[PDB]
Amino acid sequence: KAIQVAKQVFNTLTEYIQGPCTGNQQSLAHSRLWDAVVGFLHVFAHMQMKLSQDSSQIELLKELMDLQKDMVVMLLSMLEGNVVNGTIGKQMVDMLVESSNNVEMILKFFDMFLKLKDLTSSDTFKEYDPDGKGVISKRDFHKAMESHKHYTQSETEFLLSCAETDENETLDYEEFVKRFHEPAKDIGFNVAV
């Protein structure tokens, strides 16, 4: 419910400053919006890191990335009509440097799940050819990932912990459908923009 209310508020702010209004843009520039945005990215990064595990918080994660997309759309709507070395750009870069750790966290999360290093490596298919679908022998996943992905627990073992799925040894492409691939592509596209 809180995510839905925040989404509606962000949509209202966008429709306030979707068109070039200048006065409204300056009004929200000289306000407390930047602190709220910084806190929002902080809770986004930490909640994404905490909820990357488990298997019951998928819908909350979906609404979470949806609110992320809405805020990034709003932020892009701020930069409409900017020039080189604009004041809005200065406020923007101040906002980034005020929350550098959260930005690094969300970027690291986006790089691991989708945005290369996932659904691109195609583990054991182009590297081992398991004579079938992407069932994977569980231990084959750790036997894989000898690539550009880091060996840290937050990079290699992170995927293993997040992709527990079945009990004994079986995985599937449904893991790639649920985590990474379809999410974090459209959501991260606005961040890249």
Curated annotation (Swiss-Prot):
It is found in: Sarcoplasmic reticulum membrane. It comes from the Eukaryota. Channel activity is modulated by phosphorylation. Phosphorylation is increased in failing heart, leading to calcium leaks and increased cytoplasmic Ca(2+) levels. Highly expressed in heart, lung, cerebellum and brain. Detected at lower levels in adrenal gland, stomach, thymus, esophagus and ovary. Disruption phenotype: Embryonically lethal. Embryos die at about 10 dpc, due to defects in heart tube development. Cardiac myotubes display enlarged rough endoplasmic reticulum and cytoplasmic vesicles that contain high levels of Ca(2+). The calcium release channel activity resides in the C-terminal region while the remaining part of the protein resides in the cytoplasm. Cytosolic calcium-activated calcium channel that mediates the release of Ca(2+) from the sarcoplasmic reticulum into the cytosol and thereby plays a key role in triggering cardiac muscle contraction. Aberrant channel activation can lead to cardiac arrhythmia. In cardiac myocytes, calcium release is triggered by increased Ca(2+) cytosolic levels due to activation of the L-type calcium channel CACNA1C. The calcium channel activity is modulated by formation of heterotetramers with RYR3. Required for cellular calcium ion homeostasis. Required for embryonic heart development. Homotetramer. Can also form heterotetramers with RYR1 and RYR3. Interacts with CALM and S100A1; these interactions regulate channel activity. Identified in a complex composed of RYR2, FKBP1B, PKA catalytic subunit, PRKAR2A, AKAP6, and the protein phosphatases PP2A and PP1. Interacts directly with FKBP1B, PKA, PP1 and PP2A. Interacts with FKBP1A and FKBP1B; these interactions may stabilize the channel in its closed state and prevent Ca(2+) leaks. Interacts with SELENON. Identified in a complex, composed of FSD2, CMYA5 and RYR2. Belongs to the ryanodine receptor (TC 1.A.3.1) family. RYR2 subfamily. This is Ryanodine receptor 2. The gene is Ryr2. The chain holds residues 3907 to 4099 of 4966 of the full protein.
